[PDB]
């Protein structure tokens, strides 16, 4: 029973990003990870494989396995007729052994010779193209409607696709309802993370997927007039009237303040939800939050070790003939400045297997897929000084242990045969890396830090000093934009934006020390035509060219190039979205980020750009124009520095 | 559907200059790169290979794999019969995996012995000839017809051939239309770059490719009829009446000034073009530019680092058993006066993998296949100070770092052969290395057109060509406008900024006593031909030229008035075709060069266009005067010498 959704997971979107996988004699294991939502069951799962073997393989003494969680579903041999030709084969997968997180590992065995075959040879191989994929049909089930499994029915940690969570309001939400929805969206985005977050908004329209309903006891939305009035803000999870297989989270409250309290409780106090109709009464804070204090970001007050950067169990160790590279991800804030220019120093405590004779087997430490240093294996506390040349908002530190075993091969008349021995490597969760020798001072008119990390607004993980303006009685598009940008800012960090301030009139902006986030439109007191570009009046627009556009500028920007040259104004008939970052006239340190659009199609394109991440990482400079043909960015305007010294 | 053109590109051009690629045990990977126009789909994708293996290779244990985008299309095994004979093969490439940029990779696996094969040996080799290219067809689809993708429908950065963008007019263009077309051509050439730009000129006729038509609400091309009269410079993107596959960019307007406004907007305000029928209303500048400031030339205000000389992301890093040569192309202006031979001092900071033992592994620096210096890889990195003598720096040179590794892999004893896999070594240069050019001055002799053929110095001293005046004849024909557009686009492509503030005049009355360079496209005015610095004059079947009294194939860096003295002015007449490129001093300012591009017959104009279009011919241009005939370009340095610049 319930709707059935056919799913085809191509080999490109689930395998590592070389596209295809090659199974040699030293690396014959090819892994593919997928997951189950924990509320659906997989039925009629089949694995297609379009692979090419090597022509030097033996027909019967060389086959390939298909292991599903250490369970052999079937073995495929290579016939003499299909030794070098393209081979297509479909294998039925038993859905009984499927679990929440499954790993299909293909093991390849090959024997090009029979009396003197040598491993690590490039004559035997079997490569699977990226045209294959898994074909499986998920079948939804009926959950127990228990709030203890929260946010299980709305967000599962075993999923890989974007988390689309529509939020149905009651129509024209006021500032309080907007703030509550923003807090909930920030929490959901922080829980999701890299999976992607999308928050559609509808008015008096029940969606197909699981959604969250917001009520006020006065402006009751549709299909809730029959529900009786409440005395306190309650959180209830009821079924959808049409189809019970989708669940709706109804939030009630006497007024907007009770709704905000309920949202705050859902954000923080969600570890003790019990049964159904949870009543939240008292949620108060004890102490404020320190700046630059985000879970995902690295701690700068003390030296950080590798134990707090694992997010895994066996990440700092490997095995096998060719020990895979050990990757550790460092999430640093985009506000880092070093005048000493000596570079960050780390104490590596790597250990390895002592080879028989020194054969120049090495280990390479690389950063951002760029070689950094090498160390010969001939168990240490090496001090490595990383030159700060690509340390942005996110990077990857990769230790690759390159080995070559000087194994003998006998004489011309007597060749010896054996099996190659494996070697293990491990770094150890005790290697520290210093990050307190850096300062927080950067020239910040650009949008790269905002698109990648949300710096001007995510200085405090809770967004305490953040004022977001919104037009009077917003429509669905502006609310969707606000929810999406807030969820993105929350996902870049690890804490929900709970203390954000949503306003509607510009009077509150006057005389207030906090960053500004324009969504609907720039107010009258702003857009003084100074240090502001891309004013779009829904009819025409003008853009300034900064006298030069050179890719890959220097680390420290120059002011002779970043200067307005010509102001080109023009009227059009299409749709565009403008992301503009500039300085606030009230405070020098604070900034103003404006995401505006000219037409409903422009708002849709802006929401799509903010939702995804492929088109967001390619945004930099102080101005970004998103048109029907993609996003183009440029760096124009004055330069103002945020930070002390 | 649509027309399907068949092109068979060979490995002679899409491969390194040597053409043939030999796959050995050190670099068994051969690369062949080609782009996709993003507007036409591939439908045939057939590859032809002509390869010769080595006789020592084993038949079955050796083979040749062919990846398209890291996906194995097909594998060709060696056969005992074709062990040492030339082998021809055909491969059907799957067009369902083509992308904007495809890199076909040929990998060679070698096995000549079973017990012990010496890695990186010389007996293992499989060569491929330079007549083994691909055969593929392109089927053009229907474009969405929107300006948001502009200038993709009219110029794609993925192609490699010259973008022939024919510009259409209505006959007898005026000065405003001339300068507007020049601005558009300059912007298109700047966007194209080294791809080469050709701008054919059509009058009142319709092309068969992507073109740009101009209109002023008056004197229209006669095929824009029934179109409403516009009140502003609207820019629409309409289809061709004959076949809707090719698109035509129509630039309407009210007068000749509106066309100039539209051209300026297209050149500078092309970032917010959306939908179709984009109408500009105001495009004004905020501040002027500075001399010797081009988006493509290096900046002399301060020492520039290697981070601005990349044009890529992984250019300064290479991997493999033998890392490839790291090439960085820096284009400096030819005005640098370094006759003192002080040398450019650069602080290079290179990182590499330390070998197990000092084994003469070293890096070599080269400047145009030269040898600047060598640094051993056993010095136990660092800010190495390298002094490059300026006695060879031109205007489009490059710098090549070659890391030669003497990888000492063991081989075992006399009785035991130790076989293994050779570990690779990486290498990176880094973006922290710097090279200074601010401590130099601008002062050079300019009775020379080499700096004009390369980097277009005289006119491109300023990026926007502010003080640049181009004279034109009365009612220019197709050839004159074509050569004007071609030279303007070439100047714009050599630089990075479009020529916007240049002046185009139909008479020599404005150049009298005006501080600006002079570019003669047609004939020399009667007032300027009285000068004595006219080395070569091309009249109606009457040409004369002087002789420098000597000519060395490799002249010194310092000019000598004695070696280039004028002697034996010889005149003659004929009935052939010949174009002339002359450069002399202006008699109005004493520090501004006048360059003229003369031609007499239409064949001469076509020859001049073909010469100034491609860089292969322009590279041969040097000296003070150049003659272009059916046999090519021959240049000589005659006349007096005048030193332009300061100090």
Curated annotation (Swiss-Prot), chain A:
Tagged with keyword Signal: yes
Q: Where in the cell is it found?
A: Cell inner membrane
Where is it found, in Gene Ontology cellular component terms?
A: plasma membrane
Q: Which residue intervals are topologically Periplasmic? A: 1-645
Keywords in alphabetical order, please: c-di-GMP, Cell inner membrane, Cell membrane, Cellulose biosynthesis, Membrane, Signal, Transmembrane, Transmembrane helix
Q: Which GO terms describe its biological process?
A: cellulose biosynthetic process; UDP-alpha-D-glucose metabolic process
Identify the main location: membrane
Its membrane topology is listed as: Single-pass type I membrane protein
| Pathway it works in | Glycan metabolism; bacterial cellulose biosynthesis
Subunit structure, briefly? Tightly associated with the cellulose synthase catalytic subunit.
Per the record, the similarity remark reads: Belongs to the AcsB/BcsB family.
The entry's other comment says: The genes bscA, bcsB, bcsZ and bcsC are constitutively transcribed but cellulose synthesis occurs only when DgcC, a putative transmembrane protein regulated by CsgD, is expressed. Cellulose production is abolished in E.coli K12.
User: What does the UniProt record say this protein does?
Assistant: Binds the cellulose synthase activator, bis-(3'-5') cyclic diguanylic acid (c-di-GMP).
State the name under which the record lists this protein.
Cyclic di-GMP-binding protein
Instruction: Please tell me the species this chain comes from.
Output: Escherichia coli (strain K12)
Swiss-Prot record, chain B:
Q: Which GO terms describe its biological process?
A: cellulose biosynthetic process; UDP-alpha-D-glucose metabolic process
Q: List locations, semicolon-separated.
A: Cell inner membrane
Per the record, membrane topology reads: Single-pass type I membrane protein
What ranges does the Periplasmic topological domain annotation cover?
1-647
Superkingdom, taxonomy of origin: Bacteria
Q: Which UniProt keywords apply?
A: c-di-GMP, Cell inner membrane, Cell membrane, Cellulose biosynthesis, Membrane, Signal, Transmembrane, Transmembrane helix
- Pathway in which the depicted protein is active: Glycan metabolism; bacterial cellulose biosynthesis
The answer to whether UniProt assigns keyword Lipid metabolism to this entry is no
A single GO CC term for this protein reads: plasma membrane
Question: What InterPro entries has UniProt attached to this entry?
Answer: Cell_synth_B (IPR003920), Cell_synthase_bac (IPR018513)
What does the further note read?
Answer: The genes bscA, bcsB, bcsZ and bcsC are constitutively transcribed but cellulose synthesis occurs only when DgcC, a putative transmembrane protein regulated by CsgD, is expressed. Cellulose production is abolished in E.coli K12.
Q: How does it assemble?
A: Tightly associated with the cellulose synthase catalytic subunit.
- Family in the record: Belongs to the AcsB/BcsB family.
Main function: Binds the cellulose synthase activator, bis-(3'-5') cyclic diguanylic acid (c-di-GMP).
Which protein, by its recorded name, is this?
Cyclic di-GMP-binding protein
């Amino acid at each position: 029973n319930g709707p059935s959704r056919d799913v085809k997971l191509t080999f490109a979107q689930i395998a590592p990003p070389p596209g295809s996988m090659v199974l040699r004699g030293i690396n014959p294991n090819g892994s593919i990870e997928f997951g189950m939502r924990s509320d659906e069951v997989v039925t009629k799962a089949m694995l297609n494989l379009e692979y090419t073997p090597s022509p030097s393989l033996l027909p019967v003494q060389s086959q390939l396995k298909v292991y599903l969680n250490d369970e052999l579903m079937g073995v495929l041999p290579v016939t003499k007729e299909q030794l070098g030709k393209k081979t297509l084969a479909q294998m039925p997968i038993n859905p009984l052994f499927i679990s929440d997180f499954n790993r299909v590992r293909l093991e390849f065995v090959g024997h090009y010779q029979d009396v003197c075959e040598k491993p690590a040879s490039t004559t035997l191989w079997l490569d699977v193209g990226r045209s294959s994929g898994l074909d499986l049909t998920y079948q939804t089930l009926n959950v127990k409607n228990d709030l203890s499994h929260f946010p299980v029915p709305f967000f599962d940690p075993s999923d890989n696709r974007t988390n689309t969570l529509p939020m149905v309001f009651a129509g024209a939400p006021d500032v309080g309802l907007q703030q509550a929805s923003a807090i909930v969206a920030s929490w959901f985005g922080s829980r999701s993370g890299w999976r992607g977050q999308n928050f559609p908004v509808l008015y008096n329209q029940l969606p197909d997927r699981n959604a969250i309903v917001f009520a006020t006891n006065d402006k009751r939305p549709d299909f809730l007039r029959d529900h009786p009035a409440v005395k306190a803000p309650v959180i209830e999870m009821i079924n959808h009237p049409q189809n019970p297989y989708v669940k709706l989270l109804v939030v009630f409250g006497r007024d907007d303040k009770d709704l905000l309290q309920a949202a705050k409780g859902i954000a923080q106090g969600n570890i003790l939800f019990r049964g159904e109709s949870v009543v939240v009464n008292e949620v108060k804070p004890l102490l404020p939050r320190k700046p630059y204090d985000a879970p995902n970001w690295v701690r700068t007050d003390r030296p950080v070790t590798f134990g707090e950067l694992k997010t895994y169990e066996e990440q700092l160790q490997s095995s096998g003939l060719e020990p895979a590279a050990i990757n550790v991800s460092l999430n640093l804030p985009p506000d880092l400045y070093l005048m000493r220019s000596t570079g960050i120093d780390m104490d590596i405590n790597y250990r390895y297997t002592m080879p028989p004779v020194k054969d120049s087997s090495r280990m390479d430490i690389s950063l951002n897929n760029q070689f950094l240093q090498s160390f010969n294996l001939s168990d240490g506390k090496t001090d490595v000084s990383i030159p700060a040349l690509k340390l942005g908002a996110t990077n990857q530190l990769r230790f690759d242990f390159e080995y070559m075993n000087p194994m003998p091969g006998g004489s011309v008349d007597n060749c010896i045969t054996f099996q190659p021995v494996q070697n293990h490597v491990v770094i150890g969760d005790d290697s520290t890396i210093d990050f307190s020798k850096y300062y927080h001072f950067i020239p910040m008119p650009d949008l790269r830090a905002f698109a990648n990390a949300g710096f001007p607004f995510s200085r405090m993980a809770d967004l305490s000093q953040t004022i977001t303006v919104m037009p009077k009685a917003p429509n669905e598009a502006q609310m969707e934009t606000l929810l999406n940008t807030v969820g993105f800012i929350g996902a870049q960090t690890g804490f929900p934006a709970i203390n954000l301030t949503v306003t509607d009139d510009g009077s509150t902006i006057q005389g207030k020390d906090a960053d500004i986030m324009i969504i609907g439109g720039i107010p009258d007191k702003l857009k003084d035509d100074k240090q502001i570009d891309l004013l779009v009046q829904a009819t025409e627009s003008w853009v300034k060219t900064p006298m030069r556009q050179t890719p890959f500028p220097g680390i420290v920007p120059d002011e002779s190039d970043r200067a307005a040259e010509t102001r080109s104004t023009l009227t059009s008939s299409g749709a565009m979205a403008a992301v503009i970052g500039f300085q606030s006239p009230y405070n020098d340190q604070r900034s103003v980020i404006a995401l505006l659009a000219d037409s409903p199609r422009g708002y849709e394109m802006l929401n799509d750009a903010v939702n995804d991440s492929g088109k967001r990482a390619t945004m930099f400079g102080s101005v970004a124009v998103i048109r029907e043909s993609g996003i183009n960015s440029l760096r124009v305007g004055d330069v103002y520095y945020v930070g002390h010294l």
